[PDB]
Each structure stands twice: as C-alpha cells, then as structure tokens.
Amino acid sequence: ATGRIVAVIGAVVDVQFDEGLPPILNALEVQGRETRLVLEVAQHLGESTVRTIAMDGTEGLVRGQKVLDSGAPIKIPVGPETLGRIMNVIGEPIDERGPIKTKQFAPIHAEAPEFMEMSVEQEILVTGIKVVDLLAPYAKGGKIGLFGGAGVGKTVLIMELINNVAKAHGGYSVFAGVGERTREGNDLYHEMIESGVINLKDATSKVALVYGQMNEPPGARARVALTGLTVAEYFRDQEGQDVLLFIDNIFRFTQAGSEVSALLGRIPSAVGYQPTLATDMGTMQERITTTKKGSITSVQAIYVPADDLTDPAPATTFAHLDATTVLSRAIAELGIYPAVDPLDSTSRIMDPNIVGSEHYDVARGVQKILQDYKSLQDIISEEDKLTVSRARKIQRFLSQPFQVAEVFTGHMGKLVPLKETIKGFQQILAGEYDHLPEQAFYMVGPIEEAVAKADK
Amino acid sequence: ATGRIVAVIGAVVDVQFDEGLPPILNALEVQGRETRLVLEVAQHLGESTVRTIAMDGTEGLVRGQKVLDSGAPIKIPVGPETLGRIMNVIGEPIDERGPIKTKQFAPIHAEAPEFMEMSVEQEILVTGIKVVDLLAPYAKGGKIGLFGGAGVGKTVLIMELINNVAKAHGGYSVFAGVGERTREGNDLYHEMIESGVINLKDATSKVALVYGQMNEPPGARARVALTGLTVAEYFRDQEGQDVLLFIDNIFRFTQAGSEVSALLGRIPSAVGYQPTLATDMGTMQERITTTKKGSITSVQAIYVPADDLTDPAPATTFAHLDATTVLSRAIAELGIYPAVDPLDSTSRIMDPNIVGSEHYDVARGVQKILQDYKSLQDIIAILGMDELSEEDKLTVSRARKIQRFLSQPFQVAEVFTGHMGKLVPLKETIKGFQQILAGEYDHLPEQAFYMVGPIEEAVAKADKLA
Amino acid sequence: GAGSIREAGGAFGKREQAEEERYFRAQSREQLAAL
Amino acid sequence: STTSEQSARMTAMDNASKNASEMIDKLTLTFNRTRQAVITKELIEIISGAAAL
Amino acid sequence: DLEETGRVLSIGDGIARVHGLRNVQAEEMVEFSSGLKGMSLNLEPDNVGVVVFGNDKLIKEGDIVKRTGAIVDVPVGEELLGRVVDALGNAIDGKGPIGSKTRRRVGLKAPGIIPRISVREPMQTGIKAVDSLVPIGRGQRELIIGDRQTGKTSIAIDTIINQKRFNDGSDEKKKLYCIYVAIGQKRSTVAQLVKRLTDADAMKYTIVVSATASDAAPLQYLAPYSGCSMGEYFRDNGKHALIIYDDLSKQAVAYRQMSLLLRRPPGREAYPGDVFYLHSRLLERAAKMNDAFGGGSLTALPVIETQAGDVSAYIPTNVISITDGQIFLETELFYKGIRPAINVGLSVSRVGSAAQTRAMKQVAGTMKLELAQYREVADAATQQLLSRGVRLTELLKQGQYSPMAIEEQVAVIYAGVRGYLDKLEPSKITKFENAFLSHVVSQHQALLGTIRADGKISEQSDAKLKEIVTNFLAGFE
C-alpha cells in the first residue's frame, strides 16, 4: 500500500493511506530520497492517517510525498554473515564493506518466549574469568549490569568476554552501541580488529556490531537495541547457541525512549521519564532469556544519573539485572586486571542452591577475608598478619591475563575453568601456600601456574 | 422529569433531559438496576445535559438508560431511630435490621449556620491523656483534628477518645467512617454492642453510625461525611443535644473529590488536587460547628499523605480546627505512644485566663525545655553528649524524662501490648510535669517515666528497676 | 563549600559565630586598653 | 594523662566522623528524593499549563 | 449493525476509540477481530474508549469490535488449582483448557460490615519470626514491604509451601488454597517459582496468575483483580484462600502508565488521584466471613518494594493505610546474614495476635519481651540481656524452602526463651537448633503430637520439654 506524507513536525511524520492502513510498528519507506528514510508507525490517528517516528533526518520532506508500506516491522539481515560487520538500526552496512549477504531477514519486533519455553532452572555461564566466575558469577540467560566507565579496561573486558564465550561455549556475540559516540565507535571497531575478535579477511569473526550513533533521531537510538537483540535471537533460536549481547549504554536506551515518548505528545511521568518506561524496558529485556534451544546473556553498561540509584531509569533497570560487575579505578591503580571490584560486584545466583555449597563457601570465605583485610588496613596482632598475607595473595590471584591483550603485554591468555578457580581459592584460604611469595599469584591462570612462578 | 444517560466515565455520568432539567445537587434514580443507583447533579453542561456523580458503581450502565429526577437532594432519615443503626451514604440501613423508621428526612446538603448563630463558650474537655490535657487541651463544643501519616496512631487515638469521652458522655454521638477499613467498622460495631453502647433489643442506643469505606466509589466517599454531618446536625438543631461527632478519615473526603475532579473536566490545581479544594472543605466544615441552639464536639482524623504536612488537604484543614493533635512518625519510632508531636500540637484554650496560670506555665515550660533539647540535637548528634555544658546536660536529661513521661498506655492498646491502660486526671498531669520540671526526679532513670500513668507509677517503676 | 557550616546556620554555625565574637571582643578589649 | 587524652580524643573524633557520615548518607537520600520531586512538580506545572490551551 | 458491533476509530496509547456499540455497558468485555479483548472504560456520546488487554500492534483502525455482553469476569473454581493462567484466566502452562463452569466479575465490591467477623484462625507461615512475632490470621491483609532482593517472595513461597501439611490432612476447616499473582516480574522468575512449588508438591493447591514485565500494562493492572476473584470463590464457599500480590508497586506503575496515556492529571510522583482507591478496593476483598455467610476467609499478602528503604513514599504509605500491618524486610539485616531480614521492631500485626495458637503465645510473649529489652539495651544484668537477645536473634534465622510445623517452632523458641542456650556461644546456636530439632523429630514425636492436639503446652508437656531440652543440651558440644 502507498500513502502520502501529510505532516512533518521534527522527527514525527503523519502519513495518510487512502487504503489498507499499516499496523502499528510497521516500517514505511519514504520514496524519492537520496538515502533510505524509514518511518516506524506508532499510532493510528483516525481518518486513515498514521503517526510515525522517523529513523533518520526529516529535512527536505514534502507534504504529499509518497510513502510505501513494507508490510512488516523493520527487518534486518540475520545470520553468520553479520559477524564482523557493522549495521545500523535498519540493518544497513555502515562499515563500507558491501552488502550483508544473508539468506534470512528477521523483524526487530518480536514477542518474548512463551511461559512454557522458559528454562525452569538457573545455571551458571562460565566465562573463564576468575573474579567473575568466583565472586559474582553470570547466570546463563541473565542480565549483568557493568558499572564503571573510562580508564578501567571496560573494552578489554568486553573483548575478553566475547573471546572466552566463543572459545569455551561456542557461542557468538552481538554488540549494540545504543547512543554510541562515533569517535568511540570507531575506536572500538579498531580495538576489536586488532585484538582478533573481528576478522576482515576470513569468516572467523566472533562479534556482530550494531551501532546507533548519538547524532541519530531518538527513534533510531530507541530501536537499535532491538536490532542487536534480533541478531542475537537468530543466533540463539536457529543455531542453538549461548549468545552474548552487550548493550552500551542502557541508560541511553531509556533516554531515547523518553525522547520518543515526549515527541509523540505523551504526558511525562516522574523525573521526566516516559509513562511507558517499565513496559519499554520489559518488552526489551524479556527477550534476553534462556529458551529450550539456547540462551542469550546480556552484559549492559549502566549509567546512574546524578549518582542516584533511586532514579527511575536505574531503578527500572535494576529490576532485571541478575548480576553486577563493578570496574573500579582503585583496583586498577593497584595493577590488578581486570579491575573488577571484588567486594562490590554482586550476583543473584551466588546462592548454595544454585552454585553449590562448595563454590558458595569458597566465595564467602574470599569475601570475608577481603573485608577483614580492608578493616585491618583501616588502622595500619597474632593472626591479623596471617589474614593480611592471605588477603594480599587473594587480591593478587584475582588478577588474570587476557588473551585479547597478548599483543600488548606479551604474556599468554588464561581461560581458567570454574573447578580450577574454586580449587585455587580454596587452597589459598586453607593455608596451602603461606610459603610462596605474594608476587607469585600476580597475572597467572590456575594455582599450578602460581607455584611454578614461585619456583623462579 | 425523565432523562437518559448519554455518557459514563468512571464515577461521572452525563444525563440528558428533554423536559425539566433538575437543579444542581438533586438526586436522580437510575432505572433498571438491582440496587439503588443514585446520581447527584453537579453541573449543567448546556444542551439540556447535566453532569452527575454516582453514589455507587457505574458498571453495567448503558447509553440511553432512563433516569428519574427525585426533585430534592439526597435525603437521609434523621431522628432517634438512627441510633444504634448503620446507614450508608444515601441513608439505607446496612445492618440487616430492617428499615429505619424515622418521621423526618433531611437533605445532606444544607447551609452552614449564620454568623449570629455562633457560640463563644470555651469550656475544657478533659480526656485523660497527659500530652493532650497538658499541651493542647480539647474544648467542649470545639473542633479537634488528629493529623498523622500512615500507621502512626490516628485510629488508636480516636478509639481511646471514644473510650474516654464518648462512653461517659451525657448526650448522643455519631461516628462517620469515611474511606477507612471495613473490618475496623465491624470491630467498632461489635465493640459498641458488647459494651452496651449500642443496644439491639430496645431504644437505649446512644450512637449513630454512618459508613462509606475504602471499597466505595469516590462519590460515596465524597458524600458520606455529609451524611454523618446531617445526622449530627439533626441531633444538634432539632433536639438541642450535645453531640459528639467522630470522623475517620476526613482527608478521604478531599481525596475522593480529587478522583472526580479529573472526570468533571476541571483544570487541576497544585499536587493534582481539585481547584475547589478549600471551598469544598469549608462548605463541609462550617456545618461541623457549635451553635447557640446546641453543641457539637468534633474529633476528626486527618490523613497526611506521604507524611507531608504541607500537602494541600491537611494544610487547608488546619484553619478549621480549634485544637490540633499532630502525630509524628519520628516520635512513634522512638516508642513514644501516643506519637503526639509536643512542638506541633496547639489549642485555642491554651490561654492562662482559660486553663489557669499554673497549667499554662507548666505547659509553656515543658514546651520550652523540649524546644531547647531540639536545638541541642545537632551538637548532640555529631559531637556526642560529652561536649555539652552542665546546664545543657541537665536540660537534656530533664527533656528526655519529660519526653518519656508524655507517653502513656492506652486502654484500647492493651490487646497488642498487654500493659493495662492508664487514665491520668488533669491535676495529676500538671503536678507530674511540674515536678519533673522543678527537678524533683533528677535521680530516677529516664526509662522509669516510659509508659506509665501518673508520677507515682513512675516512682514505683524506678523503685522496681533498682 | 568553604563557609558551608556558617552559611547553613544551625547550631554549628551559630556556635562558630559566638566563638569568633567572644575571641575578638576579648582581643579588642586587650587591644584598646593598650592604646 | 597524655596517652589517655590522645586516645580518648582519637576515639571521640572517630565517633564524630562516623556520625557525620551516617547523617550525610541520610541527607543524601533526602536530597535525591527532594530533587526528583522538584523536577516532577515543575514538569506537572508545565504540562498543566500547556493542556489548558 | 451499530448496536452490538463497532469499528475502531483510532488506536494508540493503549486505548482504542471505537465507533458504535450503542448497547455496550460500562466496564463490559468487548472482543476485537484479532482475538484480543478489551474493557469498555469510557462511554461517550459519540464513541467508546476501550482498554486493550494486549498489544496495540494487533489492532488497526477500521477493525471490527464485537461485544460479549458480560462485564469483565474470569473463570473461577477448583479446576484452576495447579494451573498457571494469565490475567484473563487463559492457561499458559500448556495443559489444556480450564474446565471452569463458573465465572466471576473482577470488579465486585468487598463484603460490607455485617458479613464479616473478627479474624480468629491462624494462617501458619512456617517462618519462626513471622509466626512468633508477627502472627497472621485467616482474613488478614499483611504487607510484605522492603527493598529489592530482601526476601519478600521467599516469605510468600515459604507460606505457600507450608500449607502442604494442612492441605494433605483430613480437617477441611484447616486447608488453605494459595493464589500467587505475579505482576511485572520476569517470566523466567515465575517459571522458576512454579518449578520450586512443583518440587515441593505445592502446586496441587496453588493458582498462579501471571502478568509479567512484557505483558501490556492493562494486563498487569487487571491481574490482581483476577486473582482476587479466584480467591473470593473460596472465601464465599466456606473454604479458606491465601493470595499474594507480588507486587503492588508494579501494578501501581502499570496503572500510572494507563492513566498518563489517558491524559489524566498526575499527582504525587505523577501518580493518578485514584491510585489509593486502586489498591483499597482490591485489598478490602480479603475478609473473614461469619458463619451465616459460610465462615470462609481470604488472606492477602500484598508485596511492596521500597526505594532505599523509604517507607514514607506515596504508594508504601497508601498500602500501609490499607492493610492490617506490615512486615518490614531490612537490607542492613539481609547483608549482615540475618535471614529472614525481618525488622522485628517495626513489623506489626494488628489483628493477628488474637489468632496465635496458645503454645506459640506461651513462648512468644516472653520472646517478644526479651527481644524488645535487647533492642533497648544495645553491668551484669544488661550483659545478660545482650546475651539473651543475641541468642534469640540467632534463633530467629531460618533457611529457605523449609518451613516448620508450629509445634517444632514452639519447641525451639522454648529452648531459647527458657534460657537453656545462655552458655552456648552464639555462632553455634543455629547448629544446635538443627540438631535439637532433628532429635525432637525422631525420638519425641508424641510430645509434638500432644502439643499439636492440645494447642497449648500442658504442664505435663512443659515438664517433658524441660526434660528433653536438658538431656539434649547435656550431650551437646
């Protein structure tokens, strides 16, 4: 069906169809434009008119300009041919490497899996990173809030997670740059190319990039997360994989939703947010889950406005987070990498009924010894020195060298299994290594490497 | 006059009359309903259409349904036959004891008494509660208002006032439950029966009961306070009696107005409240008054939303009361009950010519020492107790003793504390606070004044502790 | 927040003012008598 | 007497700093609540003024 | 046919303006051509406003709307027990259709003053802290209020699991049928909860009504009323039902969304004016009926999530003004390992104290007094109070998914309050407790049975308890 533009107000376009109105959330192609302009239907206004939000700039639009109904929501190419590419919210390649040649397209608007398709048991997603696996593990199919921004190695952690999940579990990754600065998007593209995660020559790329920049209208930045989620949903449902989905930033997803709702003329809720804040976040986050075919685990960079955790956007995001990973600069200044704060990172599955009694006991012992060490640092007896020594060793052992950094530091990349992590920290806690020096646990894999390094 | 429904939105019904548009405030009966559905006219919209507020649920209403004009406002039975009975917003008996066989009916909408009908006498009403009797004494024929947030003790206090004042009362009494718990109404009904105040076997009952509770639609919650007012007004004007009128909660009245102000098509005011908040509240509250034809002593519980005492509804109610008891959550969390804020409760008979210079001076000294302690709170909180002068330490000690002595065990609160309730006379209160102020108990531990009656029980508790 | 304690008023700012005035009325007395 | 006042003073200032930090946390919670409420109130005023046109 | 049929004029903001339906009633369920349903909210002279129970994506302008002729109702009956349904009563567990021959309006009013009687029977949660200090009776509304991840859902699930001992017995007046309403929760969380109940064999008497985070806001708004009607079916037929609303904060958020999309004046925190009535008309339907009306009850456990522990906010104070007491779950106590993290000084039960069993009263009066003294203290008498309070606090901790019979709670609280644990170091109390319980479960079933039958600790049974506690504490570490 073909309609015509009847109103252009900013990034809102009213289009009138003489026949066959398109359903809500459909994609409409504006005709006669140098570049592709997509409009997403949002309301049926009556008298055969629909209101739409624009996915690009609306300058140079004319009333009466023809618009073509596509008969589906925004469809993007899904498949392995998206790995190593960059696409925007409408599935167009923006890395100048030609068309993304897949065999199947998928709409970016789909429903969460039915109640009978949910995995009834929680389980751990093993990342091969010692501090994460031990103190704040990742649930397979859960949401992980990644706190901490610049100067703490967030990008190295993201690339290491991509690489570790590709190696261990055999699942690919998607990276949705919601509200991404173009400078940092270019930087990240090239950091991924250098560290081997993206490969421009062969078909062994591990991540698919989906960028919605900051200079795009609020609708594009609102739907880019669903685009990345659709790529990940293909990799889960059709390949039966354990996909990783990174969303940076999630607060920008909320802000784009707020701007879109304010443009559509809806009454703002509390603190200026969209009245549909919780349902926007819900219809997005409920698709990141474990089905009977695979799973999608989402690491989501969290920004807290005004450092107020009771703000509606963080407080609505926190209702969905199954884990929390806090990258601290104080830990990075201590040379410990990754800079994961071991006392501030939390996990909901850190529970003896899910991770086991042994894993839980080891993690609680590590946490208690670190708390004890900081309480002793406050003032600086007989065993206080023993706890100080063991906690120094625990701190040093939480650090670990990453594969994606081999071209910088030269060292090898360690993917520690979960059993080895539990065993190493168990042994350090039980006093099996009070003779080794504390510098023997720095930047090693399993504990065997610690004793082999103390042999030197 | 027969009209037809043209619009239904929540509790607001637009009804269209061809002949005989009914005046504002009339009652209209909807035709074809199992129970009685009454609509009160609120606006004439032109085009022979009126807007109305429904006294019950509007589910099942159809566009085109017939509506009859009664010709008068909502009329409730008034008389001695309402005593010991429970009636709803429109005067129907809701106690399954049959019809209320009065001889006269009154419209729940009437003009307030004139300026020349006012009374100026200000006798004191001793309640037996130490903090109220000392700092903000109630008055016979006055207007009492109990402010407080959620779960700070408004209902416990109003039931203690029913227990202390209404039991030994000479005249009649009316209790209007406005937007409160229905199980609380069941509790009050069966407690007044088991105490003999309501007598299901003869005409010896002394209390009327009106109830529109928090399950009722906003129209019933908006008019049930007016129904209770009407019963009390009959007992005042037409019998010269001394009436007690207990309202709980009066805030709900205001709140219900808000819920319909949106649907009546009015521009909202501050905090989303009806623009007519103060005028509606005044139109209701000026009927709750003493005249020279009879006296009404009114105890109203006033909910404070989100503990915000500057909210439009309580801030507007403040000007209608002769005595205000402001409960505090901070004081309640310290374990002091009743949680009356001594530096926020006032009265208009706290004047030496009314209460006596001794009472006045004791109350003023108590408030002064409490204010001094409140001033010291900051230095106490950060730098601790050791950095105060000896006079500052002495005033803090005395002020904490007075704080604990302001608490009191209630007879209605035994069931969840076990401690027997104490009823302290006025002279005992003045004497005990006078003695704590003079310094006659600077040796007793401050926990010996907590939850006692008179000062002799404080001395006995201090002995038992040692 | 350099004068935050005395710009907020309250007990800690009213005691600071009193202490300042005490000290400097003492010093103004022991400065005038030495003139 | 020294070593008794230099430790009592240390403990007193420790407790003072603890109480100050506790009050700071409470006041920060109150501040965040109040600023959110102020933003919402201004928004409601603007929306109510715009809906009257 | 513009009398039983309409055409959608417009759709957007979750509300469908429909032309026609001149015979539709207010609050009547209509049905769209795409299979979706809606409630006729606003009847206007020229159109009907319809609240859609689903996604607007399914409705286009010009779609045909038929009317069902029935005010919004849900199926009720015992055929719902063991099923997971959505907010409209449609099965979502894939076990076939609900074979219900009775329907009930979701918007019915609560019983008035006369049909009720004061709460007298105990609702056994199986949690020591609740059953001893915050007792709940059948017909009560007890609020579970707290921050995120403080254990509220765990308390509700422990209650549901605990009702298994009574639902297997032969005493019909002691059975309790549970309804769990999930409002805006993750769907994976509800699936894990349903499995947790199936493992404990607690689904055969449980109905789960699920309106999750990806469901339309009208569905999350409606789910509590559907669950409440399913429970009123038992309340009005002489049986006893418990109902958990998990949670009402998310229902308030969904209702605020629906209100702001209808352009209604926002109030405090942009909530509508009738956000109090929203919860009051719902929680008033949990009642205890007198014997002229059957004698059944409906107990409500509304959950409320606070932000940074602020219980002086708008919706928390609304629900506190509605219910019959609350159970404050604190984050400071949860992080310190005290679980359940019940703030025993702020948690209150106004009408449940008259429902406590006699033996639980016998031990819990002393326990409450002693914990209170411990709270006020924190010589040789004050250090004794500290010791007793620490021992009792350690005694109030409890695991997860393992609720206790009332007699075992009585025995443990007895050993605690009578003073037998005053020489045990606190870090061992928990251990002792388990051990002690195990002993009393295997060697002394008869004393537990007679305390259960009597409902009180006889002096014979008190002597037996003293003997058993002394003899066990002797041969303990």
Ligand SMILES: Nc1ncnc2c1ncn2[C@@H]1O[C@H](COP(=O)(O)OP(=O)(O)OP(=O)(O)O)[C@@H](O)[C@H]1O
């Ligand atoms: N009595 C307990 N003992 C040990 N662990 C507990 C206990 N209660 C709760 N937990 C743990 O706390 C975790 C989260 O608590 P829970 O989900 O039950 O409460 P909640 O307030 O409903 O959380 P949410 O914010 O998701 O709504 C549980 O997974 C459980 O592991």
Ligand SMILES: Nc1ncnc2c1ncn2[C@@H]1O[C@H](COP(=O)(O)OP(=O)(O)O)[C@@H](O)[C@H]1O
């Ligand atoms: N005088 C009192 N003595 C002891 N406890 C009290 C007293 N007043 C209130 N409380 C406590 O505060 C709770 C709230 O009581 P209530 O008056 O019903 O609250 P509200 O202010 O909403 O009417 C009571 O259940 C009781 O636990």
Ligand SMILES: [Mg+2]
């Ligand atoms: Mg009350």
Ligand SMILES: [Mg+2]
């Ligand atoms: Mg929960």
